[PDB]
Amino acid sequence: ALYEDPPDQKTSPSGKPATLKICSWNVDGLRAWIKKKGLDWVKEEAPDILCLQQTKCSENKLPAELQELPGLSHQYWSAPSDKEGYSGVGLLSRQCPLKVSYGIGDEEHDQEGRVIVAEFDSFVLVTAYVPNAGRGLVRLEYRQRWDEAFRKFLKGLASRKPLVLCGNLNVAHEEIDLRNPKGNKKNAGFTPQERQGFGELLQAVPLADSFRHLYPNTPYAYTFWTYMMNARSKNVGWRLDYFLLSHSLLPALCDSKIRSKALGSDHCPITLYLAL
DNA sequence: GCTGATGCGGCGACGGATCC
DNA sequence: GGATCCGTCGAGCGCATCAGC
Ligand SMILES: [Cl-]
C-alpha cells in the first residue's frame, strides 16, 4: 500500500504551540544529496535543527552551499578517521548549543564519525548513524556490543537533562515497521537481536518512539527503500529513522512526521515538532 | 585533473515446496 | 489448487582507490 503522512499537528496535548522543529535525514552521500537539491528541500522545511547521517564527507570537503544557510549557522561535523567515504554525521542549528561532543565514549581513540551530542537549554540532542549488521549478518555481534555500549552511554546523559535521540537507528522495531517482515527476519535491520536491542533502549534509558506513540497502529510508514528493484515507487520500505524522546518530553510532543515525498537519498527526512 | 573500472558498505523478485 | 513459506539469486547508489592518459 502507498502511504500519505497526515497533516502536521503543531500544538501539544495541553495546547502549547510548537516552538522547535528538528529535521533528521540520512542523506547517503552529502555531496550527492546536495547536487540532487536536498538543501532546497531543507530550506522549505526550515527546521531549527538539522541532523544528517551517512554524509560520507570529511569536513574539508563540505560544499560551499552549506556556508549559505544563515538560519542553520552553527554546524558540527564528524567523519571516521580510517574509513573516509563512509558513515559521517552532521548537526546544524539555528541557535548555538551549550555543549557539543562526538561519539559514545572513546571517539578520540576510535574516531567512528557516527554520533554527535549537543546540549541545549531544555534538552540534550543525540544524532546517530547506527552500525549496520552487514550482509549475511557478518557484523551482527559487533552491532549487539555497540547497542549495549550506546544504551549505557545514553542512560548516563538522560540522567541529567531530557534526551532527544534521532537518526538512522538501522532497525525496524516491529513487524509494522517494514513491508516484508517475514522475509527479512534473518536480514540486517530486522533480526531478533536488533529488535531486542531497540526494545531494551526504550526500556533502559527510558525513551519513547515519538512516531509510534502518536500513530500506534499505522502501517506502511517507512523512511528507507532500497534503490534496487524500484522499491520506493512500490513503497516496499523500512522505518529505520526515528525520534526517540525521554518520557518527560512527551507533554511537549506535537507531532513526528515522515517526509515521504522528499527525494535525494534512499532515506527520506523525518521531522519533530516540540512545544518547549 | 579527469574519467571510469573495481571494491566496499549499506533485500525484494522469483521459483519451488508445503499447507489444507 | 490458492495462499503461504522458504531459500536463492541478481541487484542502485555513493565515494575511495587505482590505472590510464
Ligand atoms: Cl556508509
Nucleotide nearest to A58 (CA to C1'): C15
- With CA of A179 and C1' of each nucleotide, the nearest comes out as B12
Distance CA A207, CA A253 (A): 13
> In terms of Cα–Cα distance, which of A227, A231, A272, A265 is closest to A56?
A265
Query: What is the C-alpha R_g of chain A?
Result: 17
Superfamily of domain A1-276: Endonuclease/exonuclease/phosphatase (3.60.10.10)
For this entry, resolution in Å reads: 1.8
For residue A263, give the C-alpha cell: 527525494
The CA distances from residue A103 to A32, A77, A111, A246, in Å, are 25, 11, 7, 20
Nearest CA-CA partner of A78 in A100, A95, A49? A100
Rounded distance between C-alpha atoms, residue A256 and residue A211, angstroms? 5
Angle, helix A140-158 to helix A192-204, in steps of 10 degrees:
10
A109 CB closer than 7 A to any strand C atom = no
- Centroid of ligand 1 to alpha carbon of A85 (angstroms): 7
- A25 touches A52 (CB < 8 A): yes
Q: How far apart are the first and last CA of chain A?
A: 36
**Coil, strand, or helix at residue A14?**
coil
CA dist., res. A153 & res. A90, Å (int): 19
Residues around the ion ligand 1 (C-beta < 5 A)? A 86
Nucleotide nearest to A57 (CA to C1'): C15
Distance CA A30, CA A20 (A): 24
* A232 CB contact with strand C at below 7 Å: no
Q: Which three cell numbers stand for residue A113?
A: 564519525
Is the separation of the CB atoms in A208 and A244 below 8 Å? yes
CB atoms within 10 A of CB A257: 24
Q: Is nucleic acid strand B under 7 Å from A142's C-beta?
A: no
Q: Residue with CA nearest C13 C1'?
A: A227
A192 cis-preceded (ω within 30 degrees of 0): no
3-state secondary structure of A193: helix
Domain spans, chain A: 1-276
H or E element that contains A263: none
The answer to whether A210 and A162 have CB atoms below 8 angstroms apart is no
